[PDB]
Amino acid sequence: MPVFHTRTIESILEPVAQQISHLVIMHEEGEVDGKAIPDLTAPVAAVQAAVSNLVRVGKETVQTTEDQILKRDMPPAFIKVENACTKLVQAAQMLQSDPYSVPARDYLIDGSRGILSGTSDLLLTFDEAEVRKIIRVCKGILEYLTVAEVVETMEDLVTYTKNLGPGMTKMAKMIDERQQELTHQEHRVMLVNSMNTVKELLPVLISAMKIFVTTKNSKNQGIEEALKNRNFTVEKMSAEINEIIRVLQLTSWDEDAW
């Protein structure tokens, strides 16, 4: 079998791997031969009909995508399955010709088992490019967390906030979906806890900036205490987002690219 990385990859392939698992291991107990050649004229039609969709949408997803590791990885996988829609529609001519073929009804126990892997591989490719888009977003927030350091003005503050808040919303949104997709409880807890700690320091960051941006309008003011505070918050929020970023990297790390 293989390694199902998400709950949705598992959900799709799992059954048809639990299928070929029993539909394999039970064949020592004596399961006798039989067949249904006509109902194989169709199943291989839509099995070559959807192996035609995955390929199709897999072509818009290969051309419309800017990811480079995507193109250097996905189109190839169009091949893995291509032979599965071939060594099975082939098993079609080994269970039609000789309806007692011990090799034939075993070329479906491999052809299809190869139809999967082309799909298990197709999905990891795509899911891994998703994780890249998430990491890029978090790197975006890390950098913008940095300009907070250069906000001296009330309308600097208003611009900063106007811009930041929507990156936070985009990051939490993605960190939320992605976690709601992970199979290990420990990675999930990490993503969620860190994302929660950064949502909680956000308002604390902006607060201290406002006391900086306005206590800088009442001479003889306790300014430095506001900067110092500002800085700690960014140091904490940055540690956090880097924690997140790393756990995503650990989970989705490249094989045919660096």
């Binding site: 048809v16 969709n53 995955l54 139809i115």
Partner: peptide
Amino acid sequence: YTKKELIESARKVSEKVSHVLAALQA
């Protein structure tokens, strides 16, 4: 709708390939 498109177009492939491994419980 589009980001799934690949998932749903490949959940199909898996199920029609499940109907095929069907006939082997004879």
